[PDB]
Amino acid sequence: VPVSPLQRVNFYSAGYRLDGLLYTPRHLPAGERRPGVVLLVGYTYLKTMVMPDIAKVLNAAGYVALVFDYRGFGESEGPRGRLIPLEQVADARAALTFLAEQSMVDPDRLAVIGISLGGAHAITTAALDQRVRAVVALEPPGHGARWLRSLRRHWEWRQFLSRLAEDRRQRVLSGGSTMVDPLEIVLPDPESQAFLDQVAAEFPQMKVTLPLESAEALIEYVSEDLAGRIAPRPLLIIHSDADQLVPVAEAQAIAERAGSSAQLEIIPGMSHFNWVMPGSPGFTRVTDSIVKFLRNTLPVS
């Protein structure tokens, strides 16, 4: 049975039916198993954003790629907009189980690539799961509280923390968390706000609200504390100084904790959003860096 180059797939995570897209290289010989890559999207992003373009590059280099929506997001089941980082990591581990069961994939040659918050998930997933042979983390927050803290002036952060303590009281006493615009938690600079408005105008189905509980779980989410556990398995961290939404200091703090087997690559012309377009020079420089890392870590041969 020849495998279709593009399949809509479904698999479960904690009883929730997750929705994914499985990219297999065109005209792949029958019986041939290839390295499989799990693609992890960022904060409130849908699986159709950026990842189908990265999967196309990956398929041309001979790799099988799987992207999926986290529980509560996109086409996946789950409490709507309820973002709990360790649940997104558990979803990524269920995606590894599904991908390892595919006929065209070698279960012993699995890799994970994540963008931004998904990059922190790639690190956490590799730390807890030995099936991850290689990891790529693009623009990852190393410490949730430090990352979100840096987006506000100190007085604004203290005020946000008090709002969170009041919400913790209300959800324990009565059951529900206050639902907010995701940009009330990840407070963007005016530049990111303008791009995010453009991306939301194009993908209006990406519109969601998150419970304030998601800010508290993100504050307690420190992928830095687990980065060292990736032991001799390689990690590539791709970041830049130009990133105003996730400071490059986050990538630097992860690289110090991960050690010598990790490699930190700074790309000069690279903001949080200027490299996403497939025709852009930043897209080519990023995807070339990913493909080179995957080639000498998980060779197609």
Alpha-carbon 110 to chain mean position: 16
Q: Could you give the count of Cα atoms lying within 13 Å of 233 in the half-sphere of its Cβ?
A: 23
Q: Which residues make beta-bridge pairs with 239?
A: 266
Identify how the structure was determined.
X-ray
> Residue 21 has which token pair?
């897209």
Say if residues 267 and 282 touch (Cβ distance below 8 Å). yes
Say if residues 28 and 61 touch (Cβ distance below 8 Å). no
Say if residues 21 and 66 touch (Cβ distance below 8 Å). yes
How far is the C-alpha of 115 from the C-alpha of 120, rounded, in Å? 8
In a domain, 200, yes or no: no
Phi, psi of 33 (to 5 degrees): -100, 135
How far is the C-alpha of 107 from the C-alpha of 42, rounded, in Å? 25
Where the chain is discontinuous (C–N > 2.5 Å), the residues before each break are none
Which structural domain range is residue 226 located in? Answer: 6-149+222-295
CA angle 151, 42, 121 (to 5 degrees): 100
> Residue 135 has which token pair?
């990891």
Say if residues 284 and 181 touch (Cβ distance below 8 Å). no
How far is the C-alpha of 159 from the C-alpha of 254, rounded, in Å? 28
How far is the C-alpha of 214 from the C-alpha of 82, rounded, in Å? 7
How far is the C-alpha of 120 from the C-alpha of 131, rounded, in Å? 17
Between the alpha carbon of residue 92 and those of residues 198, 222, 244, the distances in Å are 28, 17, 27
In a domain, 230, yes or no: yes
In a domain, 205, yes or no: no
In a domain, 163, yes or no: no
In a domain, 282, yes or no: yes
CATH of the domain at 104: 3.40.50.1820
In a domain, 250, yes or no: yes
CA angle 44, 104, 24 (to 5 degrees): 50
Single-letter amino acid, residue 240: S
> What is the resolution of the experimental data for this entry, in Å?
2.2
CB-based contacts of 99: which residues, under 8 Å, 6+ apart? 22, 36, 38, 64, 66, 105, 110
> Residue 85 has which token pair?
């980082």
Let me know if 244 is exposed, middle or buried by CB neighbors in 10 A (0-12, 13-18, 19+). middle
Total domains in the chain come to: 1
In a domain, 123, yes or no: yes
In a domain, 89, yes or no: yes
Say if residues 114 and 121 touch (Cβ distance below 8 Å). yes
Q: Which of 36, 42, 1 is nearest to 186 (CA)?
A: 42
